[PDB]
Amino acid sequence: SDLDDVLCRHTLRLPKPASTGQEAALRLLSRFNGALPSLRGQTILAKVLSVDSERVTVDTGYNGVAEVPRADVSIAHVHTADGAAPVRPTTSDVRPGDLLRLRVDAPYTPYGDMQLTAVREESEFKRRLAWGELRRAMEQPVSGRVLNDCVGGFAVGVAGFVAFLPSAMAARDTTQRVGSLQSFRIVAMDEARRRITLRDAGVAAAGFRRVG
Amino acid sequence: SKPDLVEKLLSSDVLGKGERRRYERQALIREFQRHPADTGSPQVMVAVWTHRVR
């Protein structure tokens, strides 16, 4: 696994517009790690250095020091290495020395730094959640508020996103209880057109074939 | 009957005469060569050019 990876690096090191000698240890030590092969939007383990009232000083290791507003920071992003959110008496006592879970939005600004903000965009949490759950249909319900009716179904504001449940996967009593919160199940989304498809969790998932 | 339809498809009768003259152009390359499949000797060059100008 080591030798085959090294020879894969050397074999792809061939066919380049220079002779490129004395630069293969560069790729060897790149391949163990030092940078991850796709960056934009990928969450990291980052180190908090100091916390002020507003701006928190967090390591990047990639362009120096990161800056996040503290009013977005919770204890939920404090990635302990054991699997639990840490037992702390308050909810934003991020002591410097912990490992923090933040997303790089860009690696470089106009202003010398990166963005690197886990914004605690709850809508983006539901975006990553429901996109992963679209994948995870192959491998628990989601709450929504029904708002108004029209042709073919009911309008559901699910977790900050407005969807529209079709008539076939709809329950009957959702007609007579419009306005209250109840749980629903995701089916799919169409990202090119912004249409989100749901169902009632009491309505059984009879197989909609993947029209692609 | 259907194989007769296939051989009337695969004939050179149906093609556009760009493609018909290109097929007889590799017929000429099979003629003029010194060799089995020589396509760049100058005899091949002048054979192609003389037929082309005709």
Partner: protein, 41 residues
């Protein structure tokens, strides 16, 4: 996938073997992400 490539097999069979041989950390991660999902909501 790449070390199965230079072993001699083609790309898609390597992708399938990589799906079998590293899926366990994927369900561990999706359990962790559902835990973070219940944490945030």
């Amino acid at each position: 996938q790449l070390q199965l490539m230079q072993a001699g097999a083609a790309r898609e069979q390597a992708f399938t073997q990589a799906e079998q041989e590293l899926a366990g950390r994927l369900q561990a991660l999706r359990s962790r992400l559902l835990g973070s999902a219940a944490t945030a909501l």
